[PDB]
């Protein structure tokens, strides 16, 4: 649990974190502060946990393009205080 499987996992990163907000057309919107190298999956699942949405039913979209939980804010060039648009493929309301 130290050199083979440490609780850190990630390399020694500096504190470069950005605030990404998730806003769904449902009206559900929340702001999340993650690291520039941290995957959106963290906020994606988190948003749904607190908003009561299903990750399979909904979908995250940013910059006009759909995003995946495996993307990072540094890949698609997400900036601080920017917003992600969430849509429901299926019904729900």
CATH code linked to domain 1-93: 3.10.20.90
DSSP 15: S
Kindly list the domain boundaries of the chain, sorted by start residue: 1-93
Q: Determine the 3-state secondary structure of 21 from DSSP.
A: strand
User: Could you tell me if 72 and 18 are in contact, meaning their C-beta atoms sit under 8 angstroms apart?
Assistant: no
Angstrom distances, CA of residue 20 to CA of 5, 49, 85, 89: 29, 16, 11, 22
Number of other residues whose CB lies within 10 A of the CB of residue 14: 8
Q: Determine the 3-state secondary structure of 51 from DSSP.
A: helix
Calpha distance 32→81 (Å, rounded): 9
**Which pairs from 81-85 meet CB under 8 Å and 24+ separation?**
81/18, 81/19, 81/21, 82/20, 82/21, 83/20, 83/21, 83/22, 83/23, 83/29, 84/20, 84/21, 84/22, 84/23, 84/40, 84/60, 85/23, 85/24, 85/25, 85/60, 85/61
| Nearest to 26, CA basis, from 86, 70, 89 | 86
């Amino acid at each position: 649990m130290a050199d083979e499987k440490p609780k850190e996992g990630v390399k020694t990163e500096n504190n470069d974190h950005i605030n990404l907000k998730v806003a769904g057309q449902d009206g559900s919107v929340v702001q999340f502060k993650i690291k520039r190298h941290t995957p959106l999956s963290k906020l994606m699942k988190a948003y749904c946990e607190r908003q009561g949405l299903s990750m399979r039913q909904i979908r995250f979209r940013f910059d006009g393009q759909p995003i995946n939980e495996t993307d990072t804010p540094a890949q698609l060039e997400m900036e601080d205080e920017d917003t992600i648009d969430v849509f429901q493929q299926q019904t729900g309301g």
